[PDB]
Amino acid sequence: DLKSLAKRIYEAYLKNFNMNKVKARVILSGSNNPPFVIHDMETLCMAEKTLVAKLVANGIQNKEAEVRIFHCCQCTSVETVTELTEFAKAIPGFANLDLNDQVTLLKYGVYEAIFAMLSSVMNKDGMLVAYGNGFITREFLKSLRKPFCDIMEPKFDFAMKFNALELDDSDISLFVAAIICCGDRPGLLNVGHIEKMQEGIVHVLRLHLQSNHPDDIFLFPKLLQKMADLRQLVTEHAQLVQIIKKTESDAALHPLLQEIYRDMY
């Protein structure tokens, strides 16, 4: 039954991602460990002394703030790739795929999924970081020197339009499943089984949107377009990352993330 395929995907989403949209919009709105606001250099340094004490003692605050923010981004990406891999291992039919095709799907899918889910922790003024314990302002990131000021703003632009669709986690879980189970990734061995897998997920998504969002007549084709938008956003992101790896010393790539980008686009 498709009602339960959707429920299983949604339950695996709530289980595997440490931050979900309901939790995020609470923190983002107005407790015990409120988010420290990072809006200039002074507050970045204060936040680092509390949230990453070992690094400060290692002397990271001698490095350019842009380098520390980039490596903060990388650490968050590595953790999200780990969650996405477990989420996917929990997608019905994914674990039955060929080992090599699981790697291919995740390799090309993870950053599309990341930037989709990143919208959940963004508002027009900034984004949540450090497991809900920091809030870094969009204007502070815009204030960094090139090229680092170009990292986050295209993702804010995507997220504000994405958030206007007013999806909830039950929608987003299916959307991310669909991103991962994409039958036209380069390098796929058994394209036929993946397309049938994708067809079933997208079928559930289309049906779920019908019942969950009866007011938005074209929400399904809108989300198809967002999937294309995300692939272009990821292509452009990989280009900026390659610029940074080559031009900026100190901003070395984490080994897990380097393998993801290797031969990607």
Ligand X SMILES: Cc1cccc(Nc2cc(Cl)nc(SCC(=O)O)n2)c1C
238 to each of 2, 67, 86, 141, 246, how far by Cα in Å?
35, 17, 23, 19, 12
Query: Whole-number minimum distance, CB 187 to ligand X, in Å?
Result: 20
Q: Which of 43, 77, 102, 242 binds ligand X (CB under 6 A)?
A: 77
Residue 96, classed as helix, strand or coil, is coil
Q: Which of 28, 136, 174, 205 binds ligand X (CB under 6 A)?
A: 136
Compute the least distance from the CB of residue 200 to ligand X, in Å: 27
Name residues whose C-beta falls within 8 Å of residue 175's C-beta, 6 or more positions apart in sequence: 116, 167, 205, 223, 226, 227
For residues 105 and 249, give the distance between their C-alpha atoms in angstroms, rounded to a whole number. 31
CA angle 239, 240, 241 (to 5 degrees): 90
The whole-angstrom separation of Cα 178 and Cα 231 is: 13
Does the annotation flag 173 for ligand binding? Answer: no
Spell out, one character per residue from 26 to 65, where the chain touches ligand X: x when CB under 6 A holds, - when not. Answer: ------------x-----x--xx--xx--x----x--x--
Measured from the CB atom, the residue of 70 and 204 that comes closer to ligand X is 70
CB of 62 to ligand X, least distance (A): 9
Of the pair 47, 201, the CB lying nearest ligand X is at 47
Distance CA 168, CA 184 (A): 27
Q: Which is nearer to ligand X, 43 or 190 (CB)?
A: 43
**Token pair of 256, please?**
């897990």
Interatomic CA distance for residues 237 and 223, integer angstroms: 20
77 is in an annotated binding site: yes
Task: Give me the 139-158 binding string for ligand X, x by CB under 6 A, dash otherwise.
Answer: ------------xx--x---
Identified binder of ligand X from the candidate list 13, 28, 66, 80, rule CB under 6 A: 80
Residues 176 and 162: their CA atoms lie apart, in Å, by: 13
Q: Which residue in this structure is represented by tokens 């940074």?
A: 244
Q: Which residues in 164-183 contact ligand X (CB under 6 A)?
A: none
Interaction between residue 71 and ligand X (CB under 6 A): yes
Going by the annotation, the residues of the binding site for indeglitazar are 77, 111, 261
Going by the annotation, the residues of the binding site are 77, 111, 261
Contacts with ligand X, residue ranges (CB under 6 A)? 38, 44, 47-48, 51-52, 55, 60, 63, 67-69, 71-77, 80, 114, 118, 129-130, 134, 136, 151-152, 155, 241, 257
